[model samples]
Target: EFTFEIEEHLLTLSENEKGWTKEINRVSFNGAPAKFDIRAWSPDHTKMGKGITLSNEEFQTMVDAF
Candidate 1:
């Protein structure tokens, strides 16, 4: 498992049989929670799903210069 924390937010990376999954949330967000796909994509990278991806250049465009 890999992890990082920023302020109240936490990022956790854990591996599974499919590959890996990253979870991001504020400790307070439990006041509001949902079943979002943490891993989001397939290991083959063919299936485009949710969450962020460094491997995909298109992912960068999703961010703003702010």
Candidate 2:
């Protein structure tokens, strides 16, 4: 869970990337799951990921390696 100040944030979503977002209201709420998206190994250089500001509701995230 997170809170926000009065400010405008900017984000960019690349082609090979996806992101998860959440919201905060004047009511009850719960946590959300982490998400991810990306790609690699291309012949030519290109957009790789979604460059954006972290969201408040989109609280935490994790990576899996096994």
Candidate 3:
């Protein structure tokens, strides 16, 4: 089984009519350390769509690029 914990909800990038949303979150997987995550989630967060995860350094690099 897989497990995830949403350490923080940074932002909601977008949302569809059904209320599913693309969001930026700080999250942990399988009890591991949290990281920056960009993904689409169901309203209740019981389901998720494919997305990307970035480490602190990578996230900083991305932000710096903007």
Candidate 4:
């Protein structure tokens, strides 16, 4: 089964994160193989659906937000 994850990137997170856990976040996939497109959504409800490519690039952008 091919799997993809969506994140809300919450401000506060839990100590031990489970499936879809808020805190203790793993910025990128633990063992992602050949990553590709990723989406971004703003608080205003603006979205960039699969709008960017590059695995690490998306990580940085999301990190800088807020």
**Which TM-score value belongs to model 1?**
0.23
Off by over 4 Å in 3: none
Q: Tens digits of per-residue lDDT for model 2 on 3-57?
A: 3231222222232333332222122113333222222212232222222333344
Deviation in angstroms for 6 in model 4?
Answer: 14
Instruction: Point to the candidate with the largest lDDT.
Output: 3
Error of 3 at 48 (Å): 1.2
Candidate with better lDDT, 2 vs 3: 3
lDDT of 3 by residue, 1-66 (tens): 999998999999999999999999999999899999999999999898878999999999999999
- In terms of lDDT, model 2 sits at 0.27
Tens-place lDDT digits, model 4, residues 5-28: 433343433222222322212233
What order do candidates take by lDDT, descending? 3, 4, 1, 2
Question: How many clashes does each candidate structure show, in the order listed?
Answer: 0, 0, 0, 1
Point out where model 2 deviates above 4 Å: 1-37, 47-60, 64-66
Winner by lDDT between candidate 3 and candidate 1: 3
* Candidate 1 least-lDDT 10 residues: 27-36
C-alpha RMSD (angstroms) for model 2: 13.3
Judged by TM-score, which candidate is best? 3
For candidate 1, write residues 1-66 as lDDT tens digits. Answer: 433222232455654677744444332113333222233334543443356323223333444443
